[PDB]
Design a protein around this ligand. Structure first.
Ligand SMILES: CN(C)CCCCCNC(=O)C[C@H](Cc1ccc(F)cc1)NC(=O)[C@@H](Cc1ccc(Cl)cc1Cl)NC(=O)[C@H](N)Cc1ccccc1C#N
Ligand SMILES: CN(C)CCCCCNC(=O)C[C@H](Cc1ccc(F)cc1)NC(=O)[C@@H](Cc1ccc(Cl)cc1Cl)NC(=O)[C@H](N)Cc1ccccc1C#N
Lengths: 305, 305
């Protein structure tokens, strides 16, 4: 019983975090086999960062401009190259702790674990969702650049995020591990705005199912509705419209609880229209949208109450 | 910027988790040097669990009754002994991944990271606070027994919790690593009730300071109050009374934000008396009490807005 924001165990990723220094700029890198991946803006000075031309800045660097440290052990850089917004530093040693891994790009609405790091040293782990506007609501201070987000499936680490920057609103933007940004952002020190965000409906419903599985039932009702009638209310409260494929993804939770998806939509309708009236769901006083259906199944009991 | 429930990186603990089987009972153990620690109720059958006499049950076991696996590698048990509610199994191999560590008992109101494990395999990490009634609001399924809670200070792991059981209310109880229970519980399959819980006031105030540091200011006001006048309101809302030592612990946050503790108490007074009126603080619609002053300092920027 219970329901917590739960990260993947971070050990397989801790063994890959290194510190990358170029000049007076220091951030984190990800060491896999004999390659270190880090944000390319490590090559920029403070003046370069306002309007960098990265092709020019990189051509002016040599391998000896990059100090890579795995603890106190220095790693000798033997080659450098750029892939989109990621710098790739070839080192002379393959990381003996390299896990099985993939580089995958995630979709808005999906979650991942973040290993927050400073000066190559892991400091904390937490869960994040990719917002519909391609930002994440992380917890990052100066020096966290190069921290990575990941999922773990059967001892294979799927890396999906490298952290690059914080926007003026305090939310965070970065790239996949191929260096392509999530969302309409660029790695320059200029004020950039994300698009308007929306609430991830399928995740809210998954979380309501988690609540029922755990025995929180006060918000249920006997009403059912239709896909089209619900999506009218979703638009009114800035929720994403619900698709039949989302209903199917929610199938296992619907089957375990015996509550049809369109039945649960009626309960969400009333929660949106009336609030909670002082009560809580799984210890929260608002509707939580950063748990996927997979996150609920992964964490919750397989047998309902 | 940002504020998340943040766990310690789990790697140093992942390297210590093993599976302990006795008969048909399987749970998790903690392998440090040449000793495996696990809940003693691994020696009980289903009938034994209703009213066990552990001294009798252990005397009837030999080393060969205990199967210990670190992955697929079986570990040979060469001695067994009981310390309170913890079983200690001596193995023939010292764990090569043993970190620097301490066994410390924590106080109600303090936090720690939990590495949730099943069949010796870590599955998730999350933060927990020890409630004033000596329970934790964890996320645990059958088979999680033996999972541990810990803090990390300078590569030293301070183990403070081993998980033993879930109460009828869905909250969780366990022991320190010396096998002494937190709270008035015993390791028998009988319905046991925790004492009435209260809200951890100093933690709520720390979290309000985190909010200000991050630029959430709507709840502040110009009023100040006295320690005695606030503790009158705390009693009314089932908060713990505030002590001068708590004010001193909050000193660094008070100094960074420039908001005196008794000033912040006035704001908490009004939040308790009026609710939030639809607004949120750090993404929550209720007052959060599972972040210590240390957790806030550790995670938040050292410079206020
Ligand atoms: C909650 N509400 C109420 C209030 C919200 C609070 C809002 C206050 N937020 C800020 O001030 C963050 C601040 C905003 C900002 C952005 C652009 C601009 F023109 C002026 C200001 N952004 C940076 O300073 C960036 C600057 C930067 C640099 C390089 C590139 Cl390639 C890109 C960028 Cl953009 N710096 C980093 O992102 C560093 N790499 C890492 C870093 C540094 C400092 C702080 C956090 C982080 C992180 N993570
Ligand atoms: C949220 N609200 C709305 C509803 C709240 C939901 C409440 C429903 N909760 C329960 O039913 C949990 C259930 C309560 C219960 C407790 C005692 C009793 F007499 C009858 C029932 N307790 C157990 O079954 C215990 C039994 C047990 C065994 C050994 C010892 Cl040494 C001690 C104990 Cl106590 N079993 C374990 O704790 C296992 N070790 C581990 C385990 C098993 C199963 C499930 C979770 C866990 C964990 N973690």
């Amino acid at each position: 019983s219970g329901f917590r924001k739960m990260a993947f165990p971070s050990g397989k990723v801790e063994g890959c975090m290194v510190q990358v220094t170029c000049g007076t700029t220091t951030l984190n890198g990800l060491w896999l086999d004999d390659v270190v991946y880090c944000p390319r803006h490590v090559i920029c000075t403070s003046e370069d960062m306002l309007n960098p031309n990265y092709e020019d800045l990189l051509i002016r660097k040599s391998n000896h401009n990059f100090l890579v440290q795995a603890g106190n052990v220095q790693l000798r850089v033997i080659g450098h190259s750029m892939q989109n917004c990621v710098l790739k530093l070839k080192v002379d040693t393959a990381n003996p702790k390299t896990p099985k891994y993939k580089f995958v790009r995630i979709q808005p609405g999906q979650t991942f674990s973040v290993l927050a790091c400073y000066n190559g040293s892991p400091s904390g782990v937490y869960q994040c969702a990719m917002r519909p506007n391609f930002t994440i609501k992380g917890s990052f201070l100066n020096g966290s650049c190069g921290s990575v987000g990941f999922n773990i499936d059967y001892d294979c680490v799927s890396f999906c995020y490298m952290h690059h920057m914080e926007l003026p609103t305090g939310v965070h933007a970065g790239t996949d591990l191929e260096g392509n940004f999530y969302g309409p952002f660029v790695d320059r020190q200029t004020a950039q705005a994300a698009g308007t965000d929306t609430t991830i409906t399928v995740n809210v419903l998954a979380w309501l199912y988690a609540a029922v599985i755990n025995g929180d039932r006060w918000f249920l009702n006997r009403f059912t509705t239709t896909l089209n009638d619900f999506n009218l209310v979703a638009m009114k409260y800035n929720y994403e419209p619900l698709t039949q494929d989302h209903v199917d993804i929610l199938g296992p939770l619907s089957a375990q609880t015996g509550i049809a998806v369109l039945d649960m939509c009626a309960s969400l309708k009333e929660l949106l229209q009336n609030g909670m009236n002082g009560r809580t769901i799984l210890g929260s006083a608002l509707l939580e949208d950063e748990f996927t259906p997979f996150d609920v199944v992964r964490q919750c009991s397989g047998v309902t109450f």
